[model samples]
Target: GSSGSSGKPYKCPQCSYASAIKANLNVHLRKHTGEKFACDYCSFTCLSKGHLKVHIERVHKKIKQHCRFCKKKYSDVKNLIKHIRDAHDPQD
Candidate 1:
């Protein structure tokens, strides 16, 4: 694959990792620079955008249990049960 395979124009200032494609160099630079993938749901940053997806899924949505009567969201299963029991507010 020597069809100009010796060309790797993109280089990192703080890292030895090199990239032929200019776009990848920015991703590699993310390790040193703070400018990188950010989570939409929270204040989280990671090298790859995929990591943001996993963080939101596991941290935010994983514990978010929903109540049918109140239709409110709870991050803890115990709290959800408590809400269901005590939320029946007497109509007297």
Candidate 2:
């Protein structure tokens, strides 16, 4: 809501998308610069950071470890600990 003849507000450096906020516009611009979103588990990269987080929790974690005795798969040591505590050692 500007009192000017110009309609457009700000331009993004990384993309063609334009926005009113400078910071938001910059983030959008980074998307066009081929910036990588790295997964925490391995050297995997994605276009969006949100997708990378999801990939780590889903795909990367599955790739890490699996239990031999229980045929159970886990995303991290914490999950494996919980699995053993629940299924293998119910008393503790």
Candidate 3:
């Protein structure tokens, strides 16, 4: 879909992946650079803070949803919602 002359794409130094924006390319470069955010409570490390939050929710908070019928447990709400919809609810 070349409408006109586009500028040079930002190429990664480690791989063949390229992007039109510098910020996106920088984020992608973190994978090659092994950039990590470590958890304070444990030795866990992740690529971003959002991942750490999920880890903390699952590990530290121990927030779990249990199925009333099957006694199945889920760490996240969305998974439990999906399980209820799929396993418990009848299809319309």
Q: Which residue pairs of candidate 1 clash? A: none
lDDT by residue for model 1 (51-85), tens? 78788778877466788887898887678877877
The C-alpha TM-scores of every prediction are 0.37, 0.33, 0.33
Best candidate according to TM-score = 1
Stretches of candidate 2 off by over 4 Å are: 1-34, 62-75, 79-92
Candidate 1 runs further than 4 Å off: 35-68, 72-92
Q: For model 2, how does the per-residue alpha-carbon lDDT over 1-92 read when each residue is reduced to its tens digit?
A: 65456455888654467665668676676656767877666788887888888887777664656775687777676778778877788574
**Between the candidate structures 1 and 2, which one is better when assessed by lDDT?**
1
Segments in model 3 whose C-alpha atoms lie over 4 Å from true places:
1-8, 35-92
Of candidate 3, the 10-residue stretch with the lowest lDDT total is 1-10
* Per-residue lDDT value at 3 in model 1: 54
Q: What is the clash count of model 2?
A: 1
Q: Higher TM-score: candidate 1 or 2?
A: 1
lDDT at 76 for candidate 2? 74
Q: List CA RMSD, all candidates.
A: 10.1, 9.7, 10.4
User: CA lDDT of 63 in candidate 1?
Assistant: 65
By the lDDT metric, which is better: model 2 or model 3?
A: 3
